[PDB]
Each structure stands twice: as structure tokens, then as C-alpha cells.
Amino acid sequence: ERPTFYRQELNKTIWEVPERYQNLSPVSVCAAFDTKTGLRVAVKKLSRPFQSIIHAKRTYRELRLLKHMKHENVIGLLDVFTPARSLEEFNDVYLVTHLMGADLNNIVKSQKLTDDHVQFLIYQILRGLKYIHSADIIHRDLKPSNLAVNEDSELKILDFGLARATRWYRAPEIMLHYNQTVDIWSVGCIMAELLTGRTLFPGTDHIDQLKLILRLVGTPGAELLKKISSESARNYIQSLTQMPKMNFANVFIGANPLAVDLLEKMLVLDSDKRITAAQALAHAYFAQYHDPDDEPVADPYDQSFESRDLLIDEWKSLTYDEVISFVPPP
Ligand SMILES: Cc1ccc(C(=O)Nc2ccon2)cc1-c1cnc2c(c1)[nH]c(=O)n2C(C)(C)C
């Protein structure tokens, strides 16, 4: 039924969680120990979940996403609770997931990694991306800071499908008509940073970002230019002077030739010609880890709520229904 909640203030806010979650420490997200399972968990308290319609919709969206995903390389909902015992008093939402311990930015420390650690880290990203994309969901903001990694170099993806600031890993079509391969471009930027130890495109603005991107992959041809309707976007690409496409063998010299070939297939300007997650998993670069019978897909995700403009109270009760109906995973 109902458990005992205790209150404790951290990060200048008051946390109220069941007694089964002990030793809360901030990392708004806290690290905590679940005395029921013996697991170290990550606890997230949603900030002002129903302050506005946008906040209420995003609160509902985040809860719907976590309840759907059941994948090894995708963060999932272990528990969700609220101290309120009625809908009217409902104004707090807590999310409990696995605690990996660090992000990809922390464990990398801006250092070069072996080709095999790169193989393993990138394989988990694509393996989880395939599951996410099979549910018809785009991450849109894949970056090292939302890739949770433990001391075993195991990886889970965070914050997928949440976003609708520096954008070093955003596909060049989001800045400046796009599909799921916008996440594949982010994987290429991440994989390039793991191999060489520097940010591939350290842009200072959206135009400086574009200049660094075009300098590597080259100025587009007519078959790509004819698919851009934005007269401003077509201007920036062409008004930026002619730039020959770099040799990826020279940009990533010393790296595994199979790694360079995969990067050329990921960092394609034309998103219509960009490799997908499933095709990337079948690339020869992942020969040591690829198994088609262990790269499962997801059930269909009901996304129709995204196209609805509802009041705050409606998004709140829908969120409330999802909290009461939650069943913990095995
Ligand atoms: C608690 C929580 C709740 C929801 C979401 C989430 O991803 N929300 C989504 C997903 C799709 O849409 N919205 C993420 C977390 C979470 C945050 N940080 C975590 C973590 C889990 N596990 C970790 O190890 N860490 C760090 C090491 C501290 C990085």
C-alpha cells in the first residue's frame, strides 16, 4: 500500500522519499541506496512539474518515455513515486533508475581510448539507439553528458526524446526535414572524440558550427542543395567559400581503418544517405560484438499526445494515472 516518507533538504530543495531509499547524495538528481533490492539507484525530483503547460506536458512526456523503454543500453524506470495520496495534492514526481555512476564526459577525461573500448562504447550507443528508433523516437540531443557509464564501461542512454547553449553534437540539419539519423551524426561526433581526444566541431555559434562541419565533409553538391527549401540555409552553405572535403584517413590517421570507414558513413551531410543504427550495428567495425539475435527492437510507442494542446490539470491527471498504474520491472 502506502510507505513511510521522510523529508530531507538537499540542493536547497526539500526531498521527500520512501524510507527504502537511503543515503541520498546529489550528483535535480540524487544518488541513493535502495534497501529493498540492494541496488544503487539514481533518483530524480522533477522541478516544478506543473508550473506551466510546457512543464506539465514535459512532465507527462518524460514519464511516458521511461515507462516504455526496457533495454539494457536504455535508461528505464525502476520506480516512480509521489508523497501525495490524492490527485489534488499531487505536485511532486520522483523518478528512480539505475545508477551507473558517471557520464561519458567524466570517464573519458578528454583522453584517447583504445580501439576496443571505442568499439564497446559506440556499440552500446547504436544498440540502444536501434531500440529507441524502433519505437519511432528520436533522441535529438545525443551527447556525452546524457550517456551514463559505470566502471564496467557499460552504458545507458538518457534524456532521449525530451528536447523539442553549445550544440557540438547536433546534426547539421537540425541547425539550419530530418529523420532519426540526426542521432547517428551525434554518434559520429562522439566516436571521433573518443578516438582522438578532442571535440570534432568546437563551434562558437551556429554559423561557426556550420563552418567547422563543412570544412571536414566539404561543401555540398547540387543533389543535396536541391533538397533545402530555406533560402537562408542555402545561403550560409554556399556563401561559405568553397571547401574541399577532407580525407578522413588523414583526419583520423592512426585509427582503425574500419573505424574511419564507419565515421565516413556516419558523418554524411545528406541525412537521406546517412547510415542508420541497425546498418551501423552490421558494420565490420563491430565484428567482435555484433549479434543480430541480441539487438532487439521495441514495442510501438503511443506518441499521439504530442500533437495535443491540453490544459495543465489535464496533463497533471494523465501524469497521475501513469504514476498509479506503474508496475516495477523484473
Ligand atoms: C534519475 C533519472 C531520471 C530520468 C532520466 C531520464 O533519462 N529522463 C528521460 C529519459 C527520456 O526522457 N526523459 C535520467 C535519470 C538519470 C540521470 N542521471 C543519471 C542516471 C539517471 N543514472 C546515472 O548514472 N546518472 C548520472 C551518473 C548521474 C549521469
Side-chain angles (χ1 to χ4, degrees), residues 1-241 243-330:
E1 288 172 351
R2 210 260 180 181
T4 302
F5 281 76
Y6 71 98
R7 283 134 309 276
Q8 172 197 10
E9 95 158 271
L10 306 125
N11 306 122
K12 290 228 196 187
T13 193
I14 290 197
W15 286 62
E16 183 173 19
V17 304
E19 288 184 339
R20 68 182 269 186
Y21 301 111
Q22 289 286 327
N23 290 331
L24 267 70
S25 57
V27 317
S28 211
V29 183
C30 275
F33 180 81
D34 180 12
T35 56
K36 209 189 84 173
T37 65
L39 291 177
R40 262 162 55 261
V41 295
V43 192
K44 178 191 203 175
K45 176 187 187 187
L46 285 184
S47 164
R48 319 271 156 223
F50 313 119
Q51 144 203 308
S52 61
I53 308 172
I54 293 284
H55 264 249
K57 201 164 172 178
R58 207 201 306 118
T59 299
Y60 181 68
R61 169 191 310 126
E62 176 161 17
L63 185 46
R64 276 294 308 291
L65 288 163
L66 301 154
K67 287 183 74 182
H68 192 87
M69 306 307 203
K70 304 177 173 58
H71 190 278
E72 271 178 340
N73 313 121
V74 183
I75 201 75
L77 205 61
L78 300 183
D79 194 19
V80 48
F81 58 88
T82 174
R85 231 191 300 197
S86 91
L87 168 61
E88 162 63 20
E89 274 290 305
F90 176 54
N91 213 338
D92 269 21
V93 185
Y94 295 83
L95 303 160
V96 185
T97 73
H98 281 107
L99 178 66
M100 307 296 284
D103 67 21
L104 192 51
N105 201 337
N106 294 331
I107 69 110
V108 160
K109 300 134 312 190
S110 279
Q111 97 192 87
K112 290 205 195 195
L113 319 184
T114 71
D115 188 58
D116 194 77
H117 306 142
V118 168
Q119 284 166 46
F120 189 45
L121 289 172
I122 299 304
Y123 174 77
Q124 299 175 80
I125 299 170
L126 296 166
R127 185 168 176 258
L129 274 195
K130 176 194 184 184
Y131 181 90
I132 288 168
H133 292 179
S134 59
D136 201 20
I137 288 156
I138 305 176
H139 194 308
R140 289 184 186 79
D141 196 17
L142 192 54
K143 57 199 189 187
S145 77
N146 53 41
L147 291 168
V149 170
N150 65 3
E151 318 196 75
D152 255 30
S153 270
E154 285 163 342
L155 177 145
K156 292 185 186 296
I157 300 183
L158 319 170
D159 298 336
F160 42 89
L162 213 51
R164 326 291 294 216
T166 61
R167 312 257 164 243
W168 293 338
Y169 309 88
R170 220 156 206 94
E173 57 264 30
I174 300 177
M175 278 164 302
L176 219 50
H177 186 318
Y178 77 84
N179 52 48
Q180 317 190 301
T181 71
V182 294
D183 297 326
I184 298 301
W185 178 277
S186 319
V187 177
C189 299
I190 291 173
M191 175 176 161
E193 193 172 341
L194 303 178
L195 292 162
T196 71
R198 43 178 78 181
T199 317
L200 194 52
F201 312 114
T204 47
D205 48 68
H206 290 212
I207 305 309
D208 185 56
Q209 267 285 131
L210 189 62
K211 184 186 189 163
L212 308 179
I213 290 173
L214 289 171
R215 156 138 63 78
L216 174 81
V217 303
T219 324
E223 264 191 311
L224 180 45
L225 279 174
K226 68 167 54 184
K227 310 203 251 183
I228 300 165
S229 54
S230 167
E231 291 266 333
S232 164
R234 251 186 292 104
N235 204 254
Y236 277 111
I237 276 150
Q238 292 171 272
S239 202
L240 259 59
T241 166
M243 295 173 228
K245 176 189 187 219
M246 291 221 204
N247 287 327
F248 281 51
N250 283 128
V251 178
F252 308 98
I253 192 134
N256 189 346
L258 287 185
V260 183
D261 187 274
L262 176 64
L263 286 165
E264 291 228 29
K265 298 186 159 58
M266 287 186 170
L267 299 168
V268 171
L269 212 38
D270 195 346
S271 75
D272 289 353
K273 266 88 186 200
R274 197 171 304 149
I275 196 174
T276 66
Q279 297 171 330
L281 291 160
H283 196 275
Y285 183 59
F286 308 108
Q288 312 312 125
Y289 304 91
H290 173 54
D291 188 355
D293 305 317
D294 201 18
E295 293 150 359
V297 292
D299 296 304
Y301 169 75
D302 178 19
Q303 210 192 303
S304 71
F305 77 93
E306 296 282 2
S307 74
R308 315 236 167 79
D309 290 329
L310 305 178
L311 305 181
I312 289 177
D313 284 356
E314 286 163 326
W315 290 123
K316 164 160 145 180
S317 68
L318 287 174
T319 303
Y320 192 76
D321 303 338
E322 295 290 337
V323 177
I324 308 299
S325 73
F326 173 76
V327 167

